Amino acid sequence: YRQSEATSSFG
């Protein structure tokens, strides 16, 4: 998990 507001991946 990435702390940054993940983009495209959206988890």
UniProtKB/Swiss-Prot annotation:
It comes from the Eukaryota. The modification Phosphoserine is found at S9. The modification Omega-N-methylarginine is found at R2. Transmembrane segments: none annotated. Expressed in a defined zone of basal keratinocytes in the deep outer root sheath of hair follicles. Also observed in sweat gland and mammary gland ductal and secretory cells, bile ducts, gastrointestinal tract, bladder urothelium, oral epithelia, esophagus, ectocervical epithelium (at protein level). Expressed in epidermal basal cells, in nipple epidermis and a defined region of the hair follicle. Also seen in a subset of vascular wall cells in both the veins and artery of human umbilical cord, and in umbilical cord vascular smooth muscle. Heterotetramer of two type I and two type II keratins. Interacts with PNN and the actin-binding domain of DMD. Interacts with HCV core protein. This keratin differs from all other IF proteins in lacking the C-terminal tail domain. Involved in the organization of myofibers. Together with KRT8, helps to link the contractile apparatus to dystrophin at the costameres of striated muscle. Belongs to the intermediate filament family. There are two types of cytoskeletal and microfibrillar keratin: I (acidic; 40-55 kDa) and II (neutral to basic; 56-70 kDa). This is Keratin, type I cytoskeletal 19. The lineage of its organism: Eukaryota, Metazoa, Chordata, Craniata, Vertebrata. The chain holds residues 6 to 16 of 400 of the full protein.
